[PDB]
Structures are given as structure tokens and as C-alpha cells.
Symmetry: C3
Subunit: 130 residues, 3 copies
């Protein structure tokens, strides 16, 4: 489904913070003893509403809440870190969880450039037929 922002307002710009997990450390800064404290590990950036992605993202986070809260109600884990990894596994299982029937709509195998490996190899034997 498409996402329809139905909020009273939308801040169209996203001034965000996150961590850089693979930081190009300078000298000893990667050593915990010498590195930044908890407050100084963040990077920042600014994103504008190109393609309406910011207003759509606000609505998406909004619409995600019901399913996320129901998932949290059903789990006994106190802190859940595994949602994205489980999504990655389900991505793979949806495509590769069974036999891949080539040309099938649910089999992600492209034999396009391989048919030209053999349709140029029709003149293998039918062209050279002295």
C-alpha cells in the first residue's frame, strides 16, 4: 500500500542524529579509554522532503506503531534488538525457502544473458553442418 500522511502537520525537514558504526578513527580515538563519552558519539545530518519521503516517513512510523506494540506485547524479551535481522531472514526465506522454479514469478533467477550464450550457440552445429 502507498502511504498517505494524515497528520495535523508535517515537519518536511528531518534533522537527524545517529551513530557511525564504522568510523574512520583518527589515532587513538577508537580506544574506549581515550575516545568520546556517551554524549559525543553522534553524527548529524539534514534531509529535505524530496519525493515526499519525510512526510511519508512520519506517517509510516505512525502506522507501524500498532503492529510493533502487538509484537512487543507477545514477546518475553525485555529489550528487542532482532527485528531487522528477522526481516533480513524473512527476505531470504521468501525467495529461497523452497525450490526455485526458473521463469516462475516467485523465483528470482534471470537466465536472459545465459539464453544468448546458447542461442548464439545454435550456429554451433546447425551452421557448421558440412
Amino acid at each position: 500500500e502507498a502511504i498517505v500522511n494524515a497528520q495535523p502537520k508535517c515537519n518536511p525537514n528531518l534533522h537527524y542524529w545517529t551513530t557511525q558504526d564504522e568510523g574512520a578513527a583518527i589515532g587513538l580515538a577508537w580506544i574506549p579509554y581515550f575516545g568520546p563519552a556517551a554524549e559525543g558519539i553522534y553524527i548529524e545530518g539534514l534531509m529535505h522532503n524530496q519525493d515526499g519521503l519525510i512526510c511519508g516517513l512520519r506517517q509510516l512510523a505512525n502506522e507501524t506503531t500498532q503492529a510493533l506494540q502487538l509484537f512487543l506485547r507477545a514477546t518475553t524479551e525485555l529489550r528487542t534488538f532482532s527485528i531487522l535481522n528477522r526481516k533480513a531472514i524473512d527476505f531470504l526465506l521468501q525467495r529461497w525457502g523452497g525450490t526455485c522454479h526458473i521463469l516462475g514469478p516467485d523465483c528470482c533467477i534471470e537466465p536472459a544473458d545465459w539464453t544468448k550464450n546458447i542461442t548464439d550457440k545454435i550456429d554451433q552445429i546447425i551452421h557448421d553442418f558440412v
Copy 2:
């Protein structure tokens, strides 16, 4: 291996409880503040011994214990939530962890309907040969 129930008795019916993780919530019931308490999140059902699955399941849980206890002895995690996700990964790695040699017994790729895409395409060029 097949499962042979070797227990003194078997309750052939399984009156079970579980959680519905994607619940079709009614109104505000998905909001933790308004929703059910810990005791009211469960659904119930009843399963009979069709195909002997209940008596087999009791024996399976029984026979699983040794390996499960040895796994728990070797882990340092206090609470283990990852067994099923690891099983899913190993499912994928067993089939897709290496090169898939088509027609091989360990490669789950079916080219059956794709050979008829090219065996009906023998009359491509051998039929139309004026």
C-alpha cells in the same frame, strides 16, 4: 529418524495456549495503557491426535531435551531467544551456502518448465529451415 513414543502414557489431545502476535485489534485494545494485562493476552485451541502428531510431539519434546540442555550448558547467554532464527539461517546455508550446481542433489533449482521453454524452441530453427 521417525519418532516412537516410548512414554508410560500419552494424552492424545493438546489443549494449548499461545499469543497472537498480529492480533486484529479492536479500537484502542492494541495500546498498552488500554489493553489487556499480562494474564489476558493468550489465545487457546484444541488439537487431536490426527496422524499421531500429538503423541509424536510429546516424544519429540522428550527426546529434544538432551541436546537442548547441552546447548544451554555451553552458552553464556542467560536467556536464549535465538534457536529458531539460527535454525532458519542454517536452513538457508545448507541450500545456498555454496555454488548451486543445477541437477545436483543438493541444489534446489528446478529447470523443468524452463527446458520446455527451449525444447518447444527446437522448432525455432530446425522447423523453420526453408
Copy 3:
């Protein structure tokens, strides 16, 4: 990249300890109540510097530290058990995260023994052509 041990010294032998997760238990030893205490769950072994793997491994662990410490700085998990499982997922996603274009350098599908299934099947119809 290759690994170049740049340490002051290298102990070329690895006297290691680990756990056997699938232990061939003898009798009741798998039962926690009867089994070994925390100090008696370990197996041991000895590895020599064949192919320079021990000296390389010491350097690898050394060189891994910066990236590992930066990963730990960016996570909010108190104890991280998921690095290897995430590596396995990324292994699969790198090969199977998109459409597999056969003969492509990033598609791990081998049609070698399947082309002989059809190149011996050129004499299907071109040999038997009465």
C-alpha cells in the same frame, strides 16, 4: 588483504580451550543436576603453526580490535551475541539478496553439468533426423 604479523613476538602454538556444544553424553551427565560444574565443561586441544595460521590468527585478532570496539561503541546492547549470526545473514544477502543473473560474476550458480545435459541433447533431434 593478507595478514602480516607485526607483533614483537609470536607464540606459534595455540593451547586452546572451548566447549563441546553437542557432547556425546555418557548416561546422566547431560542432566544439569548431575552434570559437571561450571569449571568442568571445557575441552582442550593443541594447534601448531601449520601454514602460519597461529601467527596470522594472533595478528588478525589484533587488527580486528578497532572495528570491533567501534561496533561496540555504537550498539546499546549490553552483551553482544549476534556478530556471527549477522555475518551469516550478510553472507547469504551478498549472494542471494537480488536477482541471480546466471554467468554473472556475482551469481553463484553453476550450469556446467546442466549444459552437458543439453549439449548431449543436441543429438536429440539433429542426429535422429530421418
